[PDB]
């Protein structure tokens, strides 16, 4: 039912070599796994998110976001990343994102809790 | 059972008057609803996220994040916010966050697609 | 002269205990020194920036920003912070900011080069 | 002189087609002009900033940042952008940045005051 449900669902790769496997639901849900090529991370991590299942009709992208907490059956980095961005369809579909990575900190170190960055995902590895 | 499952589960209010109702699952899931006091938003929106269910024991906070897409059965703002932050428990429990709000845009307007801000959530209004 | 030249010029303090000493010029310049209470920083660092010297008259704040490179005669942290925000006048004047701290990194580590945060500066603290 | 004073100094273009003309001083200063290809912007705006004039020698980039207030003799957008990033010298020199654009707002609209994005600058015009 989602306008971009079929386009979003599948396997995506970012510029770092990370792998993002996602199913878009008709209700706006995103569910899948994330494997990071960098950082204190090994194997797949659960991800969950949301996307706009009825986007604008003027050629705009489709807003979405998702979260990974960096704990799985191998490691725990005591941190979580959220990606905020939009899906852009067409011949070379892309999910363009900016992200925030927060680590658990003491109060004294809270000022340095959060990294910001940007990831671009494609359906073919770069 | 997640270490902070009981502390996170419940209702949170930010500095703007928005309301965040969340259930923390034993496996690290966050599920619930968000009601925003500002912006193109009315009634409740679905939220989903994750939290660290086995955090450090050194006094550090508990890392977490969640997403809301601003579409429900009443409105659609063609946008989505992600909050990234940490839960700090105790008498004056807090969830301290930074957030990214992306709107769907044309490619030419993508440079102005994403707002950044910070929200602090407490257990009282 | 700048509309908020006199209001911005002076000594400001943020929530961490850092001190921001600034002169606003009639031409939109910001020039001064920054002393950070946290991080790889000791004593004062040069700052430079810009502000809107003819802001809106509808009660809106005054947009501004400035940079500190964390090198002085005593230390070098191989990093730089930019604060982006707005000055809000009145009995309880504030400069509300969000900031980006970038450290020099190898290309392999570029994904972790930049912190984001927020500081609120007041004239009393 | 700064290690990268000669390398940073010059004319740069980002992926939007904006033009960044900058002079790096031996004292860590950045001065120059910015012309944006997008937004409420016309002609050149004053910029000022700072860079690390004695960076690490381990292959790391050179940290820097600069500000533009979007007021000149032609327009006033009641806004300011700060770019935070690092200069990477060598083959295909690049300045990689993330930026924050804050507009003056009323207190009720302060939550919507700030955009975030990322710009990459090279000396080759797109
Ligand atoms: O595809 C992809 N992959 C990437 C992108 C986006 S997700 C990303 C993959 C993430 C996989 C998990 N990577 C771990 C993160 C936590 C870690 C670390 O290196 N943290 C940090 C390093 C440098 C700067 C930081 C600033 C703020 C906070 N963290 C920063 C760490 O231990 N942090 C800390 C431990 C203990 C105390 C801390 C106190 C303050 C801050 N951090 C602390 C170890 C590596 N896209
Ligand atoms: O008033 C105030 N005060 C505060 C606020 C806003 S300004 C702030 C005061 C700043 C004073 C300078 N503080 C130094 C920063 C550089 C330092 C460090 O701790 N860096 C980092 C720590 C944690 C997370 C990081 C994420 C990304 C990158 N850095 C993070 C460091 O050595 N970093 C690094 C060294 C070598 C290689 C690196 C590779 C990647 C990242 N960092 C590297 C040492 C402390 N408001
Ligand atoms: O090279 C390059 N170029 C680009 C990049 C990085 S710099 C960039 C060039 C910038 C040149 C100036 N462009 C003006 C900015 C202000 C403007 C606008 O579109 N603002 C905004 C549009 C969309 C989202 C916003 C979110 C938050 C705030 N602004 C957003 C505007 O009028 N904003 C406002 C006016 C009145 C009230 C406001 C209240 C809240 C927020 N904004 C308000 C008009 C265009 N790299
Ligand atoms: Ni960390
Ligand atoms: Ni650092
Ligand atoms: Ni604006």
Author numbering:
A (entry chain C), D (entry chain B): 10 to 135
B (entry chain D), C (entry chain A): 10 to 134
Question: Could you pull the original sentences from the published paper?
Answer:
Depending on the biotinylated metallocofactor, the assembled ArMs exhibit a diverse range of activities. Sav is a homotetrameric protein with four free biotin-binding sites (four FBS) consisting of two pairs of close-lying bis-biotin binding sites. The pronounced affinity of biotin for Sav ensures the tight binding of a biotinylated metallocofactor to the Sav scaffold.
Additionally, we converted the original dimethyl group to a cyclohexyl entity to minimize the influence on the dihedral angle between the two amido-quinoline planes. Accordingly, the cofactor [(BiotC4-bAQ)Ni] 1 was synthesized, see, Scheme S1 (ESI†). For this purpose, we assessed the quantitative anchoring of the [(BiotC4-bAQ)Ni] 1 into Sav WT by a HABA displacement titration using CD spectroscopy as readout. The determined dissociation constant was Kd = 0.29 ± 0.05 μM (see ESI†). Upon incorporation into Sav WT, [(BiotC4-bAQ)Ni] 1·Sav WT hereafter, the resulting ArM afforded significantly higher TON (TON = 54), underscoring the positive influence of the second coordination sphere provided by Sav on chlorinase activity. Based on the collected datasets, it is apparent that the [(BiotC4-bAQ)Ni] 1 lies close to residues N49, S112, K121, L124 as well as K121′ from the adjacent monomer. Based on the structural information, we performed genetic optimization of [(BiotC4-bAQ)Ni] 1·Sav WT targeting positions Sav S112 and K121.
